Amino acid sequence: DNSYKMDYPEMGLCIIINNKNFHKSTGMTSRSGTDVDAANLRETFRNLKYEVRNKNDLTREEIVELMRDVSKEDHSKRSSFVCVLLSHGEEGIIFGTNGPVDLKKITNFFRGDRCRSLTGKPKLFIIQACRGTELDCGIET
Amino acid sequence: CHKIPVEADFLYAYSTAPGYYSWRNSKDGSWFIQSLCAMLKQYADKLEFMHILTRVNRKVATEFESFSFDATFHAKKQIPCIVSMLTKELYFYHH
Amino acid sequence: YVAX
Numbered sequence: 001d002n003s004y005k006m007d008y009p010e011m012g013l014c015i016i017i018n019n020k021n022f023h024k025s026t027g028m029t030s031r032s033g034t035d036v037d038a039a040n041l042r043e044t045f046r047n048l049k050y051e052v053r054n055k056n057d058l059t060r061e062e063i064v065e066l067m068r069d070v071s072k073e074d075h076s077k078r079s080s081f082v083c084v085l086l087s088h089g090e091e092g093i094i095f096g097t098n099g100p101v102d103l104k105k106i107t108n109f110f111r112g113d114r115c116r117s118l119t120g121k122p123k124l125f126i127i128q129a130c131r132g133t134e135l136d137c138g139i140e141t
Numbered sequence: 142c143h144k145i146p147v148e149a150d151f152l153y154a155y156s157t158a159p160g161y162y163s164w165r166n167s168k169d170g171s172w173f174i175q176s177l178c179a180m181l182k183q184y185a186d187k188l189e190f191m192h193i194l195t196r197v198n199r200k201v202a203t204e205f206e207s208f209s210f211d212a213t214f215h216a217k218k219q220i221p222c223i224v225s226m227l228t229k230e231l232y233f234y235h236h
Numbered sequence: 237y238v239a240x
Contacts (some may be wrong), residue, residue: 001229002229002230003229003230003231003232004227004229004230004231004232006231006232006233006234006235007235011233031165032165032167033165033166033167033168033169033170033171034165034170034171036168036169036170036175037170037171037174037175040170040174040175040178041174041178044177044178044181044182047182048181048185048233080231086171086174089163091159091160107151107153110151111147111148112145112146112147112148112149112150113147114147119145119150120145120150121150122150122152122227122229122231123150123151123152124151124152124153124154125151125152125153125154126154126174126177127153127154127155127156128156128163128165128171128173128174129156129163130157130161130162130163131155131157131158131159131160131161131162131163132159132160132161132162133160133161133162134160134161134162135161135162135213135214135217136158136161136217136218136219136220137216137217137218138206138216138217138218
């Protein structure tokens, strides 16, 4: 028992939320190039045998509803769960097209006690989004 | 009784460190995502996930640097952030 | 190059 059991009938779902266009009120400019990421991820996970589902430009409300519905599915025959978020963000926050939503709110649907069919199975969240406005000037090697 | 934390078995692979911006190339995609996909494609059939993500960290840290007409955003770097609450090793393959 |  040093490795996760990954021989279930299915590797699991890979949900990709690709937000590119946002409402003006947010002041976030179109995330050019995010479609390339979304397609790369889809193909990459497809080869790893995951059931990939791509969703584009979801509002903060739609993201929460999607995560809730997914977490309520029967993941019994799945080895794991993967979710990739591509959007603008801030520390602890991810942006729906119309506004911010706490990451904790999203991941909580999959808590060991709230999604029993995934208890003890690896739940991966891949997050491509800013976590503030600090810039790394780097150092010469 | 035989219980496990409700926060156990989660892995959050952040594209950048806490408080920092995350970089993206308008043409090729985000630094983190293109690196992650390349490393998964090259090593998923062998290496454990944390080691694959460590490779992603290095690729992002060494091969990318921003270029901007705005000196404020020019020549910047980025390091991803692996946050693991996993309790076991993860391999995307089976024997 | 764009920041997210």
